[PDB]
Structures are given as structure tokens and as C-alpha cells.
Amino acid sequence: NKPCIISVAITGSLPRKKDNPAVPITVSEQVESTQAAFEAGATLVHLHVRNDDETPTSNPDRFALVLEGIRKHAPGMITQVSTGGRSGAGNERGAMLSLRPDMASLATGSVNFPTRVYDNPPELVDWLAAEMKTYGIKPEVEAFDLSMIFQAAAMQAAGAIVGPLHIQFVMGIKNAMPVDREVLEFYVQTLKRLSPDATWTGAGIGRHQLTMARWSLELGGHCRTGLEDNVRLDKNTLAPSNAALVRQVAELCEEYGRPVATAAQAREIMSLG
Amino acid sequence: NKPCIISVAITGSLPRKKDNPAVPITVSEQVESTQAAFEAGATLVHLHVRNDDETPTSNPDRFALVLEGIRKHAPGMITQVSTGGRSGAGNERGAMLSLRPDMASLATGSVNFPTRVYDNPPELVDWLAAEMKTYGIKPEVEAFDLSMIFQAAAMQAAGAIVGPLHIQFVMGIKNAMPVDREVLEFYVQTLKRLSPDATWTGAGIGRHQLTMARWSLELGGHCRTGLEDNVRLDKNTLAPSNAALVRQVAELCEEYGRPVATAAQAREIMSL
Ligand SMILES: [Zn+2]
Ligand SMILES: [Zn+2]
């Protein structure tokens, strides 16, 4: 009965045109892919930007052009910029925050990724959180491991994160946290114990994208999909668009009796302006 | 009345003589501190080595001298070398594995530490484990976070780690996993689900050293103490030796009705 927010991670930093031509790279491609996903039921856009040669970038000018197009073509949709980056990258990872999006991703710890370490030094975590506060941005805590939930709660208690927490439990990444029902249940129980008014989203990478969406719907959480996490619609078929992946989650919403949240409902659930 | 193994982390990479003069730095100091801890009830020694100026090092020649002294002065004691190191350090973190100690520490993931990231690249984790498998070394998985238990179980299933797993649940480090009873209980439940024949040790830093020892004794695990994790006997007093910290844990073992394991019993429990 409770509405479900559908987040759409459109691009990411790894997916290329060779993996799936549906992956939006240019400003026009990202705006059109977001609008189609918004019309399919998505109310939150998780945004990574790319250079013309498909290489990842934190370029604030590229972010500004895409955010402007999203506000015009998908009105009311929650904008969420990514603060992800390579190992060794510092303040550059939060150079787009002054554009004042609705939200921004915040990894509160470090974790192993498939080929490298996803480095998030404590000094960088503190700086990114302080910048989001300065520009009135609501953080989305990216919890790639258990300790990151404790770090998020300790930061909220100290006043480093303002208002109710929104945390994303990420599962299915090689060398990080695998997709596990008992761990997700413990994640929710731990979040409830540390931060009772917090909201959460379950996120699955690859073939476990729909599995994490089903579990999130059952456990009273919210959903995330998109080409950033998975380029396949099923084992044999590539996803023709981000909107096609949003439709899969929207279909699961009707199956579990939870209505797809509107833009106004999504902002209310996560206590946004 | 299951026996309890007492591990002693004698030096570490951070504690200095200015923090506590009981911290063993030289080869002679580390051998005599280990022998005293062994006579106090410790059957496993977690070993870090230092340069003469107290700076941390992975020097295999320094490790060889200390391991030789431990084998002579503490016969039967399980030897465990540390493979810890700074960010950017590669295979040199496992340059002492050829010395064939009984055991070696193995962080199976990366985690945030108080001032930096404790980097453990996947390629380094694989290389360290393969070196331990080559030299017949039983790894001690250092679980600073939940995913490291899953990584350890996946490595054992693939054959990267041989025999029953031994995992150490580390709590109390700033920016890593805080001291929490419910998380430790979930750690044990998860380990039992993934690796039913695995053994485990609970480790606490600073004030949480004795807290984790009490919880490990209650939950059917093993204990770890030593100057590497805590330099104080209590809030007002510094620990006069590693043996004094081992005595605290040995007293807790009798309090919880679990006997202090002998060197032979510790080797049987570890499947060594
Ligand atoms: Zn992202
Ligand atoms: Zn150590």
C-alpha cells in the first residue's frame, strides 16, 4: 500500500556503447534517456557524466547542461549527482555540488571493487558531506558494506548529515558485498536501531538488479534500476533503454501492491523541498 | 568447558616507547615479551617487527631473528606474522612468508582507518593468500567489516584458502567497525552459515580489548590481547608487559568456566 520510489542510474562510469548502444553518453542522450525513464515511473535520477570519447568525468559544466535539460524535460524529478571517482582523486569529486542538485551520492567508507579499491578517505567523506550541507543538498549514503551504515548514523548524530537519512544498500559487486537476503534484513534492522526515521533503497548490480528490487518492495524499501548497474533486460536480451528497465521495476510495484510514487510523493518520503 | 586460545599481539606498527616502555621494539625485547606472555597462557603470537628507531618494517631478516627466538624460548607456541602495511605497498607486505610461520594475517578487504584508508587491493589479497598456500601457512582472516567474512568464505570455496577458516572479528577502530554486540552475534551467525567448521577470535582495540574478550568467551570464540591493541591495564595504569594483559584474559577464561588452551590444544583447535 505504501508508495515506492524508483531511482534510475542512467550512465555510471564503466558502461560503454560497445556494452549496450542504449547507454546515454552525450548531453542530449542523457536528457532524452532520463525523460523516457521519468515517463516510465522513475522519480529520482542518479547522474554520472561522460566526456565525448565515453571516458568518465566530474566536469561541472557537463553536469550543468544535463541538470538544466532534466529540470525542463522531467519537471519535479529529483536530481542526484554522483560524487564517485578514481583512487587518488580528491575535492574534484565534489566540484559539481555548487550547481545545487536535490541530492548527491555519498560513500561513507572504502570497499574493494572488481579490479581496484573504491577509495573514500575519511577526510574526503567529511569534505563532501560539508559541501552538500553548504549547498542545501540531501546526501544519499552509499552503503557498500556494514560499517558504512554505522558511519552514516555517527555523522547524522554529530550533525555532519542533516535531516532523516536516506541510505542505499548496494549488493552484487565483485569483491564488495554479495547479494544476500539475511544481510539485507540485518542492514534494515541495524538502520532502524541507529536511525529510526531513515528511508532506504536496495540496489543490485548485474543479474541481481531485479532480485534487489523485489526484496526492497517486500521489506518496505525503495527501488533502483538503470544501465549503470545492469545493461541486460534478461540473460539473452540487452536493455533497449533505461525506461525499459524502469518498466520492469514498475511492473514489480503492481505485483507487490505498492503504487509507483509520483514526483511530489517521492520528495515527501525523502523530506525534500 | 571448551578450551580458549589466547592470542598475543606484542608490538603492532603504531605503539611506541613514549606510549608505554613495555612495548617490545628490539629482537631481544620481542623474544622475552613473547616468552613471558607464553608462560602467562598465550599460545599464539601475532608478530609485527620494527626498525631500531621504532619505525614499522616488513624486513624478513628482522622477522627471521624474532621467529627463531620464539621457537627456542616458547616451544609449541603458534607463530603468526603480520602482512599489514601502508597504502601503495604491494608484494613487500608478504616478503616474510618464505620463513614458513605457522600462521599469517590476511585482510580480505579494504576499510577506513582513523587517519587513512587501510588499502588491501584484490590483486594483493589473492597474491598474499597464494603465497601462504605455497608455504603451508594457515591464514588468519582479519575481518574489519562484514564483506570480509563473505570474501574469506568465497576464497575457501575456490580453494584459495586451505583447511578450516580462522577469522578474527576486529572492533573499536575509528572509521571502521565500532564495538557492537549485535554485529558480533551476526558475524558468528554468518560465519556458521558460510563456513560451519570455522574457528574465530574476537579482537578489541583500547578500552574495548577486555569487552571483546568477554564476548568471545560467551559466544564460543577465542581471545586476543597485547600492547598492539591496548597499552593500558586500566584507566589509571599502563600495562607493565604483554604477559600482564594475557593474565587479564586468563582470569576471564576461569570466570567464564573455559580453560586456557595449551600449545598442543591450540594447534588441534586450529587444525595445525
Ligand atoms: Zn553511481
Ligand atoms: Zn597486526
Side-chain angles (χ1 to χ4, degrees), chain A residues 2-17 19-31 33-71 73-86 88-206 208-253 255-273, chain B residues 3-70 73-85 87-231 233-234 236-253 255-267 269-272:
Chain A
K2 198 181 73 182
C4 181
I5 299 162
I6 303 173
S7 293
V8 63
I10 61 160
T11 303
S13 59
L14 276 81
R16 297 281 195 269
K17 288 285 188 186
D19 300 301
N20 190 337
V23 174
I25 300 297
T26 66
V27 174
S28 62
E29 280 177 345
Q30 286 190 306
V31 169
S33 183
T34 302
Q35 186 185 341
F38 176 74
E39 292 167 356
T43 52
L44 186 152
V45 57
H46 175 81
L47 179 66
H48 283 245
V49 300
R50 303 281 192 91
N51 294 306
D52 294 332
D53 64 352
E54 300 188 61
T55 61
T57 186
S58 298
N59 186 11
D61 293 320
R62 191 88 168 190
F63 265 111
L65 287 166
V66 183
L67 292 168
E68 190 189 320
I70 293 168
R71 286 190 292 267
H73 294 92
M77 199 191 201
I78 300 163
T79 58
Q80 184 183 102
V81 301
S82 172
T83 63
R86 63 194 185 274
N91 54 60
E92 306 106 344
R93 288 176 56 177
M96 81 296 295
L97 301 176
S98 62
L99 294 167
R100 297 181 74 99
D102 292 302
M103 295 181 79
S105 288
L106 179 68
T108 55
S110 296
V111 70
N112 275 359
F113 261 25
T115 61
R116 67 170 187 104
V117 177
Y118 184 36
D119 282 290
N120 295 289
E123 56 266 48
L124 181 62
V125 176
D126 293 338
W127 184 85
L128 288 170
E131 288 298 290
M132 290 168 204
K133 266 208 285 81
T134 298
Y135 297 107
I137 302 161
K138 183 196 170 75
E140 176 175 278
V141 173
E142 304 302 332
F144 294 93
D145 214 337
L146 185 59
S147 73
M148 300 194 201
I149 305 168
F150 284 88
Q151 187 63 262
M155 289 170 70
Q156 182 188 47
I161 300 170
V162 65
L165 284 165
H166 185 73
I167 191 162
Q168 182 161 268
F169 307 130
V170 185
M171 290 176 164
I173 299 169
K174 190 191 181 195
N175 299 326
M177 184 63 68
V179 169
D180 188 271
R181 173 82 177 192
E182 291 261 286
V183 173
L184 182 59
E185 288 180 7
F186 187 73
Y187 273 1
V188 180
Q189 287 169 15
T190 304
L191 179 71
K192 190 187 161 70
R193 174 164 60 95
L194 301 169
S195 200
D197 62 333
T199 58
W200 64 270
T201 296
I205 276 76
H208 299 111
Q209 189 179 55
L210 291 173
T211 301
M212 289 293 288
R214 288 186 183 98
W215 292 351
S216 298
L217 281 154
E218 289 176 359
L219 295 165
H222 304 281
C223 300
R224 171 175 151 146
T225 190
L227 297 165
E228 163 169 342
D229 305 323
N230 177 47
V231 296
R232 290 270 187 182
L233 196 71
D234 53 74
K235 193 179 174 65
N236 302 324
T237 313
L238 286 167
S241 64
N242 276 298
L245 294 169
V246 173
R247 186 186 168 175
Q248 285 186 319
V249 173
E251 284 170 348
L252 289 170
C253 282
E255 185 187 319
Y256 290 91
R258 288 184 59 178
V260 173
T262 62
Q265 286 178 324
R267 292 178 180 274
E268 169 262 295
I269 293 156
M270 281 177 292
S271 309
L272 286 160
Chain B
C4 182
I5 300 163
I6 303 173
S7 293
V8 64
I10 61 160
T11 303
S13 59
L14 295 168
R16 301 291 189 95
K17 289 285 188 186
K18 298 168 78 183
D19 300 301
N20 190 336
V23 173
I25 300 296
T26 66
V27 174
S28 182
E29 279 177 345
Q30 286 191 305
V31 169
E32 69 187 317
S33 182
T34 302
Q35 187 185 341
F38 176 73
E39 292 167 356
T43 51
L44 192 150
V45 57
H46 175 80
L47 179 66
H48 282 244
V49 300
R50 303 281 192 91
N51 294 306
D52 295 332
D53 64 352
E54 300 188 61
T55 61
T57 186
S58 298
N59 186 11
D61 293 319
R62 190 88 169 190
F63 265 111
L65 288 166
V66 183
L67 292 168
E68 276 176 37
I70 293 168
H73 294 92
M77 198 188 200
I78 300 165
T79 170
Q80 186 183 102
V81 300
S82 171
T83 63
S87 299
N91 299 344
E92 56 270 15
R93 285 176 56 177
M96 81 297 292
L97 295 177
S98 301
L99 294 167
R100 296 182 192 257
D102 291 302
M103 295 186 75
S105 297
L106 179 68
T108 55
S110 296
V111 70
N112 274 0
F113 262 24
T115 60
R116 67 170 187 104
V117 178
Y118 184 36
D119 282 290
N120 295 289
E123 188 186 323
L124 180 62
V125 176
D126 293 338
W127 184 85
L128 289 169
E131 288 297 290
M132 294 173 202
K133 183 175 176 181
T134 297
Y135 295 108
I137 299 162
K138 182 199 177 75
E140 176 175 280
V141 174
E142 304 302 332
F144 295 94
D145 214 339
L146 186 59
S147 73
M148 300 193 201
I149 305 168
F150 284 88
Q151 277 287 101
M155 289 168 71
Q156 183 189 47
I161 300 170
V162 180
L165 276 165
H166 183 72
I167 191 158
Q168 182 160 269
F169 308 130
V170 185
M171 290 180 174
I173 299 169
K174 190 190 186 291
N175 299 326
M177 184 63 65
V179 65
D180 189 270
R181 172 82 178 191
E182 293 166 82
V183 166
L184 181 59
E185 288 180 7
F186 186 73
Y187 274 1
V188 181
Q189 185 191 287
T190 304
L191 179 71
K192 191 186 176 184
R193 174 164 60 94
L194 301 169
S195 200
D197 61 334
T199 59
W200 64 271
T201 297
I205 278 73
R207 179 178 66 96
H208 316 290
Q209 185 166 263
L210 290 174
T211 300
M212 290 295 293
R214 289 180 183 264
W215 293 352
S216 302
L217 282 156
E218 288 176 0
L219 296 165
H222 304 281
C223 298
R224 170 176 152 146
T225 189
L227 292 161
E228 162 169 342
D229 301 338
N230 176 42
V231 297
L233 201 73
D234 56 64
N236 301 315
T237 320
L238 285 167
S241 63
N242 276 299
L245 294 169
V246 173
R247 278 190 286 271
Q248 286 186 317
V249 173
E251 284 170 348
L252 290 174
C253 291
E255 186 181 292
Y256 288 93
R258 289 181 62 187
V260 173
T262 62
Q265 286 178 324
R267 292 183 173 272
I269 295 158
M270 290 287 193
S271 301
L272 290 168

